[PDB]
Each structure stands twice: as structure tokens, then as C-alpha cells.
Amino acid sequence: IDAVDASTVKRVANKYIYDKDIAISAIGPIQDLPDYNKFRRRTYWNRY
């Protein structure tokens, strides 16, 4: 646990989160929930 520093978190997040496919499971009143494509775009920041 102590070996997980700020640079380690960023490396792992880039391996697993950055521009990665996601799975979505929703139930109930979910018409206002954004579509898969919106959620997929929000996996990366184009300003960097």
C-alpha cells in the first residue's frame, strides 16, 4: 500500500481508465442518464 504514490495512481489510471470502454447497468427512471457515447467521451480530457 505504501508503494502506491501519486505517480503510481496516474500510471494505473492511464492503464485502466483513460480512453477505455465501459459497462453500464441502469434501472428505474433513466431517460436523463447520458448515452454510452457521452460516457465514453468523458473517459479522457481533450484539453491535455
Binding site: 470502454d21 431517460q31 454510452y36 457515447n37 465514453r40
Partner: protein
Amino acid sequence: PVKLKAVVYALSPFQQKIMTGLWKDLPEKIHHKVSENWISATLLVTPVVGTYWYAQYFKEQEKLEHRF
């Protein structure tokens, strides 16, 4: 807001082929286009083509009649 009861399954755009569907079941696509629209195409082409040919026939007869 409309009350709705439904289950929707969707697949990621990066897990499917994008363009090969353009040339799939092409015979069915052509058959559907022809069979559903041949009356519509007839109603648009026939008055235009028929009127055009009649005018050319009229001009040809008028031109020949004025000759000596």
C-alpha cells in the same frame, strides 16, 4: 415526460464492424427499393418523358410541313 417501460441492450461502437453492413443483403435492399417505389417512379418519369417526346414530335412535324 412520457412514462415508458423498456429494456435496451447496446454494444460499444468499437466492438462491431462499421462499414461491411453497406453491402450486406444487397439483393433484398434492391428488391425492397424497386417493389415499393415503382409506382412512385412511374408517376414522376412518365409525364415528364411523355410530354418531352410529344413536344419533339410536334416540332418535327411542324418543321417538315413548312418546307418546300
